[PDB]
Amino acid sequence: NLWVTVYYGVPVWKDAETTLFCASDAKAYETEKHNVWATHACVPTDPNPQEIHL
Amino acid sequence: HVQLWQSGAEVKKPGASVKISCSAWGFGTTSGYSFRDYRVHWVRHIAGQGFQWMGHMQPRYGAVNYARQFQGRITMTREVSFDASGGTAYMELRSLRSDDTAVYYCVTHKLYDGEDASDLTWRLDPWGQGTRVIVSS
């Protein structure tokens, strides 16, 4: 016999669209002069990128 | 990189008045990095007696604060520009005497190109060239 077992956190993804916010280095912009592409409003990115191979 | 440029050396006479300009540029536009936040002290260096503090002028509203020995005879005015990244600072000493001959320096308190030093007004990095005022007959 078999019974349904629900698993949370399975490594399953589906193709979809979403809202992609912005992150940038603090040192990239001078922090004194404005930019046409607003960099101050972007969240500060992590110093060490977290890239995971699959 | 804030740079302060002063006026040329002046030779006056006792009882005259000297007005030394101080051009400041490179502050920046963002609040806390603008000329309307960093005071412009005026320091006198008499040869032999060391440096002397004369007063500071805060360029937002022109709030000045003179030293006790100079009250009633020194006046500071500003010419803060539109972008507030630059400006000009003036000092007038209206009761020049023979003991006022020295080199006058205008200074600010912005050490670094990316730090907000608005509330730390006594780190006098950007010294001006120095205007050698000579008062004699």
Cα nearest neighbour of A27 on chain B: B114
Quote the tokens at residue B16: 């005259």
Q: For residues B40 and B106, is the Cβ–Cβ distance under 8 A? A: yes
Which residues make Cβ contacts (< 8 Å) with residue A17, sequence separation at least 6? Answer: none
Distances (CA, A) of B67 to B3, B19, B62, B71: 25, 17, 16, 6
Residue B136 contacts A, CB cutoff 8 Å: no
Cα atoms found within 13 Å of the Cα of residue A8, Cβ hemisphere only: 0
Identify the residue among A32, A39, A40 best suited for mutation to test binding to B, counting B beta carbons within 10 A and taking the highest.
Answer: A32
Q: For residues B34 and B27, is the Cβ–Cβ distance under 8 A? A: yes
Cα nearest neighbour of A29 on chain B: B114
The experimental method is: cryo-EM
Q: Tally the residues of chain A.
A: 54
Note the resolution in Å, 1 decimal.
3.2
- Cβ-Cβ contacts under 8 Å, A31 against chain B: 30, 33, 114
Residue B30 contacts A, CB cutoff 8 Å: yes
Helix, strand counts (H, E) of chain A: 0, 2
Q: For residues B26 and B113, is the Cβ–Cβ distance under 8 A? A: no
* DSSP for residue A42: S
Q: For residues B91 and B42, is the Cβ–Cβ distance under 8 A? A: yes
Round the CA-based radius of gyration of chain B to a whole number and report it.
15
Q: Would the CB atoms of B28 and A34 count as touching at under 8 Å?
A: no
What is the C-alpha to C-alpha distance for residues B51 and B39, in angstroms, rounded to an integer? 18
